[PDB]
Amino acid sequence: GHSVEIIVRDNCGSCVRVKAQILPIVEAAGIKLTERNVDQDASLKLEFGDRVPVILVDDEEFACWEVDNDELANALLLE
Amino acid sequence: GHSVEIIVRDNCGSCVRVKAQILPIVEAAGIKLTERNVDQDASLKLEFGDRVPVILVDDEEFACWEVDNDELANALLL
């Protein structure tokens, strides 16, 4: 089994979208997703504030991020 | 004209994976992707060290990231 936690902040559309994207996968694993907010726990603002939202798997920051290749292509075809 | 840089650290599989994922896009644009390593440059570590890999387009921090659902599913479901 694994634990999964998302670290979010207030007024964070990216936080809400990432949560909605991962919920089916976490639920398929039989896991309860936990959520902590850097605007409530300053210890977390200090540790993670520069890169929220963060996903923790087994209480370790988990690298499950990819570049949007269409947004990257769009930037490169602009003058 | 454009530049693309990836900012990396040593022994980071996520840096290698992202570099491979973006390489065809940078090369479709006739651009040569460059690479700088925070473990070889202390200023660069101060700025980016805790959130590599970072992508710079025209020297600005590219913000359009998405969750890799299949990578998370792989880690949790197998």
PDB file of C-alpha atoms in Angstrom:
ATOM      1  CA  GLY A   1       0.000   0.000   0.000  1.00  0.00           C
ATOM      2  CA  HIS A   2       0.916   3.710  -0.383  1.00  0.00           C
ATOM      3  CA  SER A   3      -0.059   7.091   1.119  1.00  0.00           C
ATOM      4  CA  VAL A   4      -0.764  10.027  -1.272  1.00  0.00           C
ATOM      5  CA  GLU A   5      -0.935  13.663  -0.165  1.00  0.00           C
ATOM      6  CA  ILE A   6      -1.385  16.839  -2.231  1.00  0.00           C
ATOM      7  CA  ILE A   7       0.158  20.113  -0.822  1.00  0.00           C
ATOM      8  CA  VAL A   8      -1.968  23.083  -2.060  1.00  0.00           C
ATOM      9  CA  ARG A   9      -2.552  26.803  -1.377  1.00  0.00           C
ATOM     10  CA  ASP A  10      -5.626  29.068  -1.425  1.00  0.00           C
ATOM     11  CA  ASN A  11      -6.716  30.620  -4.783  1.00  0.00           C
ATOM     12  CA  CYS A  12      -4.853  27.904  -6.727  1.00  0.00           C
ATOM     13  CA  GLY A  13      -6.698  26.712  -9.891  1.00  0.00           C
ATOM     14  CA  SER A  14      -3.737  24.437 -10.674  1.00  0.00           C
ATOM     15  CA  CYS A  15      -4.135  22.794  -7.180  1.00  0.00           C
ATOM     16  CA  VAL A  16      -7.873  22.104  -7.870  1.00  0.00           C
ATOM     17  CA  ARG A  17      -7.246  20.749 -11.443  1.00  0.00           C
ATOM     18  CA  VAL A  18      -4.316  18.454 -10.303  1.00  0.00           C
ATOM     19  CA  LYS A  19      -6.519  17.075  -7.461  1.00  0.00           C
ATOM     20  CA  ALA A  20      -9.368  16.283  -9.932  1.00  0.00           C
ATOM     21  CA  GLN A  21      -6.859  14.608 -12.397  1.00  0.00           C
ATOM     22  CA  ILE A  22      -5.234  12.302  -9.750  1.00  0.00           C
ATOM     23  CA  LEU A  23      -8.373  11.393  -7.680  1.00  0.00           C
ATOM     24  CA  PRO A  24      -9.440   8.455  -9.962  1.00  0.00           C
ATOM     25  CA  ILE A  25      -5.906   6.922  -9.829  1.00  0.00           C
ATOM     26  CA  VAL A  26      -5.619   7.343  -5.999  1.00  0.00           C
ATOM     27  CA  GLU A  27      -9.188   5.859  -5.581  1.00  0.00           C
ATOM     28  CA  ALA A  28      -8.277   2.893  -7.981  1.00  0.00           C
ATOM     29  CA  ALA A  29      -5.357   2.093  -5.570  1.00  0.00           C
ATOM     30  CA  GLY A  30      -7.769   1.927  -2.578  1.00  0.00           C
ATOM     31  CA  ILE A  31      -5.990   4.993  -1.016  1.00  0.00           C
ATOM     32  CA  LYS A  32      -7.522   8.023   0.780  1.00  0.00           C
ATOM     33  CA  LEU A  33      -5.888  11.205  -0.687  1.00  0.00           C
ATOM     34  CA  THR A  34      -4.816  13.629   2.130  1.00  0.00           C
ATOM     35  CA  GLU A  35      -4.532  17.409   1.538  1.00  0.00           C
ATOM     36  CA  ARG A  36      -2.473  20.042   3.436  1.00  0.00           C
ATOM     37  CA  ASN A  37      -2.467  23.816   2.666  1.00  0.00           C
ATOM     38  CA  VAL A  38       0.731  25.970   2.953  1.00  0.00           C
ATOM     39  CA  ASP A  39      -1.545  28.954   3.906  1.00  0.00           C
ATOM     40  CA  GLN A  40      -2.547  27.005   7.130  1.00  0.00           C
ATOM     41  CA  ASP A  41       0.831  25.305   7.885  1.00  0.00           C
ATOM     42  CA  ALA A  42       3.734  27.789   7.492  1.00  0.00           C
ATOM     43  CA  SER A  43       6.198  24.870   7.928  1.00  0.00           C
ATOM     44  CA  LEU A  44       4.913  23.580   4.567  1.00  0.00           C
ATOM     45  CA  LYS A  45       5.049  27.122   2.979  1.00  0.00           C
ATOM     46  CA  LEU A  46       8.737  27.213   3.882  1.00  0.00           C
ATOM     47  CA  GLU A  47       9.439  23.659   2.535  1.00  0.00           C
ATOM     48  CA  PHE A  48       7.235  23.552  -0.634  1.00  0.00           C
ATOM     49  CA  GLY A  49       5.797  27.099  -1.295  1.00  0.00           C
ATOM     50  CA  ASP A  50       7.979  27.724  -4.423  1.00  0.00           C
ATOM     51  CA  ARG A  51       6.460  24.692  -6.343  1.00  0.00           C
ATOM     52  CA  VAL A  52       2.816  24.075  -5.151  1.00  0.00           C
ATOM     53  CA  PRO A  53       0.961  21.957  -5.943  1.00  0.00           C
ATOM     54  CA  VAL A  54       3.274  19.086  -4.746  1.00  0.00           C
ATOM     55  CA  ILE A  55       2.305  15.389  -4.691  1.00  0.00           C
ATOM     56  CA  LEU A  56       3.769  13.262  -1.818  1.00  0.00           C
ATOM     57  CA  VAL A  57       3.808   9.430  -2.242  1.00  0.00           C
ATOM     58  CA  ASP A  58       4.786   7.537   0.937  1.00  0.00           C
ATOM     59  CA  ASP A  59       5.561  11.072   2.400  1.00  0.00           C
ATOM     60  CA  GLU A  60       8.259  11.684  -0.333  1.00  0.00           C
ATOM     61  CA  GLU A  61       7.850  14.405  -3.057  1.00  0.00           C
ATOM     62  CA  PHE A  62       6.967  12.352  -6.186  1.00  0.00           C
ATOM     63  CA  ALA A  63       8.074  13.386  -9.718  1.00  0.00           C
ATOM     64  CA  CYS A  64       4.883  12.820 -11.833  1.00  0.00           C
ATOM     65  CA  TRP A  65       5.055  16.029 -13.932  1.00  0.00           C
ATOM     66  CA  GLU A  66       5.395  16.436 -17.708  1.00  0.00           C
ATOM     67  CA  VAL A  67       5.729  19.564 -19.901  1.00  0.00           C
ATOM     68  CA  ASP A  68       2.633  20.335 -22.032  1.00  0.00           C
ATOM     69  CA  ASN A  69       4.360  19.730 -25.443  1.00  0.00           C
ATOM     70  CA  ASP A  70       1.577  21.625 -27.306  1.00  0.00           C
ATOM     71  CA  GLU A  71       2.044  24.752 -25.017  1.00  0.00           C
ATOM     72  CA  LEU A  72       5.853  24.387 -25.526  1.00  0.00           C
ATOM     73  CA  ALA A  73       5.407  24.079 -29.367  1.00  0.00           C
ATOM     74  CA  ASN A  74       3.031  27.161 -29.277  1.00  0.00           C
ATOM     75  CA  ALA A  75       5.759  29.209 -27.493  1.00  0.00           C
ATOM     76  CA  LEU A  76       8.408  28.135 -30.078  1.00  0.00           C
ATOM     77  CA  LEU A  77       6.340  28.879 -33.199  1.00  0.00           C
ATOM     78  CA  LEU A  78       5.671  32.508 -31.987  1.00  0.00           C
ATOM     79  CA  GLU A  79       8.047  35.292 -33.166  1.00  0.00           C
TER      80      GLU A  79
ATOM     81  CA  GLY B   1      14.513  33.301 -32.625  1.00  0.00           C
ATOM     82  CA  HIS B   2      14.217  31.080 -29.513  1.00  0.00           C
ATOM     83  CA  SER B   3      16.335  29.253 -26.929  1.00  0.00           C
ATOM     84  CA  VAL B   4      15.331  26.326 -24.698  1.00  0.00           C
ATOM     85  CA  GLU B   5      17.359  25.235 -21.672  1.00  0.00           C
ATOM     86  CA  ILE B   6      16.701  22.421 -19.188  1.00  0.00           C
ATOM     87  CA  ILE B   7      18.025  22.918 -15.597  1.00  0.00           C
ATOM     88  CA  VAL B   8      18.871  19.526 -14.008  1.00  0.00           C
ATOM     89  CA  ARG B   9      20.647  17.862 -11.020  1.00  0.00           C
ATOM     90  CA  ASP B  10      22.777  14.609 -10.886  1.00  0.00           C
ATOM     91  CA  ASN B  11      20.904  11.230 -10.392  1.00  0.00           C
ATOM     92  CA  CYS B  12      17.477  12.633 -11.327  1.00  0.00           C
ATOM     93  CA  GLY B  13      15.468  10.201 -13.506  1.00  0.00           C
ATOM     94  CA  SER B  14      12.719  12.877 -13.769  1.00  0.00           C
ATOM     95  CA  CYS B  15      15.260  15.322 -15.423  1.00  0.00           C
ATOM     96  CA  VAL B  16      16.258  12.555 -17.964  1.00  0.00           C
ATOM     97  CA  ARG B  17      12.547  11.678 -18.656  1.00  0.00           C
ATOM     98  CA  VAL B  18      11.464  15.333 -19.196  1.00  0.00           C
ATOM     99  CA  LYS B  19      14.557  16.036 -21.405  1.00  0.00           C
ATOM    100  CA  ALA B  20      13.557  13.043 -23.680  1.00  0.00           C
ATOM    101  CA  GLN B  21       9.846  14.101 -23.722  1.00  0.00           C
ATOM    102  CA  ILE B  22      10.641  17.726 -24.872  1.00  0.00           C
ATOM    103  CA  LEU B  23      13.663  16.931 -27.169  1.00  0.00           C
ATOM    104  CA  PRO B  24      11.574  16.200 -30.368  1.00  0.00           C
ATOM    105  CA  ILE B  25       9.615  19.516 -29.936  1.00  0.00           C
ATOM    106  CA  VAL B  26      12.805  21.612 -29.520  1.00  0.00           C
ATOM    107  CA  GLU B  27      14.335  19.786 -32.562  1.00  0.00           C
ATOM    108  CA  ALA B  28      11.102  20.221 -34.670  1.00  0.00           C
ATOM    109  CA  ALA B  29      11.769  24.042 -34.096  1.00  0.00           C
ATOM    110  CA  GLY B  30      15.360  23.612 -35.443  1.00  0.00           C
ATOM    111  CA  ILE B  31      16.585  24.530 -31.889  1.00  0.00           C
ATOM    112  CA  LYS B  32      19.395  22.643 -30.031  1.00  0.00           C
ATOM    113  CA  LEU B  33      18.239  22.033 -26.418  1.00  0.00           C
ATOM    114  CA  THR B  34      20.921  23.134 -23.919  1.00  0.00           C
ATOM    115  CA  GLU B  35      21.436  21.781 -20.342  1.00  0.00           C
ATOM    116  CA  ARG B  36      22.861  23.367 -17.137  1.00  0.00           C
ATOM    117  CA  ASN B  37      23.322  21.354 -13.876  1.00  0.00           C
ATOM    118  CA  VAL B  38      22.676  22.937 -10.421  1.00  0.00           C
ATOM    119  CA  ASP B  39      25.353  20.575  -8.888  1.00  0.00           C
ATOM    120  CA  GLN B  40      28.054  22.424 -11.008  1.00  0.00           C
ATOM    121  CA  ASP B  41      26.825  26.015 -10.292  1.00  0.00           C
ATOM    122  CA  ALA B  42      25.872  27.314  -6.797  1.00  0.00           C
ATOM    123  CA  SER B  43      23.913  30.434  -8.022  1.00  0.00           C
ATOM    124  CA  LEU B  44      21.759  28.103 -10.249  1.00  0.00           C
ATOM    125  CA  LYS B  45      21.147  25.772  -7.236  1.00  0.00           C
ATOM    126  CA  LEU B  46      20.055  28.831  -5.096  1.00  0.00           C
ATOM    127  CA  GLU B  47      17.486  29.788  -7.794  1.00  0.00           C
ATOM    128  CA  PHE B  48      16.143  26.383  -9.034  1.00  0.00           C
ATOM    129  CA  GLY B  49      17.721  23.594  -6.962  1.00  0.00           C
ATOM    130  CA  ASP B  50      14.626  22.350  -5.097  1.00  0.00           C
ATOM    131  CA  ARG B  51      12.368  22.152  -8.262  1.00  0.00           C
ATOM    132  CA  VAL B  52      14.463  20.669 -11.113  1.00  0.00           C
ATOM    133  CA  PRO B  53      13.796  19.906 -13.823  1.00  0.00           C
ATOM    134  CA  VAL B  54      13.098  23.552 -14.830  1.00  0.00           C
ATOM    135  CA  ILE B  55      12.576  24.577 -18.514  1.00  0.00           C
ATOM    136  CA  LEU B  56      13.663  28.091 -19.634  1.00  0.00           C
ATOM    137  CA  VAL B  57      12.230  29.373 -22.927  1.00  0.00           C
ATOM    138  CA  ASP B  58      14.063  32.567 -24.066  1.00  0.00           C
ATOM    139  CA  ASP B  59      15.539  32.522 -20.552  1.00  0.00           C
ATOM    140  CA  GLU B  60      12.000  32.605 -18.777  1.00  0.00           C
ATOM    141  CA  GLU B  61      10.574  29.782 -16.446  1.00  0.00           C
ATOM    142  CA  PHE B  62       8.087  27.769 -18.600  1.00  0.00           C
ATOM    143  CA  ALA B  63       4.908  27.248 -16.517  1.00  0.00           C
ATOM    144  CA  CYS B  64       2.723  24.774 -18.561  1.00  0.00           C
ATOM    145  CA  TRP B  65       3.201  21.513 -16.609  1.00  0.00           C
ATOM    146  CA  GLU B  66       0.608  18.779 -16.248  1.00  0.00           C
ATOM    147  CA  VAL B  67       0.381  15.698 -14.051  1.00  0.00           C
ATOM    148  CA  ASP B  68       1.805  12.533 -15.743  1.00  0.00           C
ATOM    149  CA  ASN B  69      -1.250  10.323 -14.876  1.00  0.00           C
ATOM    150  CA  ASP B  70       0.347   7.119 -16.293  1.00  0.00           C
ATOM    151  CA  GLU B  71       3.542   7.682 -14.215  1.00  0.00           C
ATOM    152  CA  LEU B  72       1.451   8.103 -10.983  1.00  0.00           C
ATOM    153  CA  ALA B  73      -0.808   5.073 -11.945  1.00  0.00           C
ATOM    154  CA  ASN B  74       2.376   3.032 -12.577  1.00  0.00           C
ATOM    155  CA  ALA B  75       3.779   3.942  -9.106  1.00  0.00           C
ATOM    156  CA  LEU B  76       0.476   3.233  -7.212  1.00  0.00           C
ATOM    157  CA  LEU B  77      -1.308   0.410  -9.188  1.00  0.00           C
ATOM    158  CA  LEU B  78       1.581  -1.998 -10.186  1.00  0.00           C
TER     159      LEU B  78
END
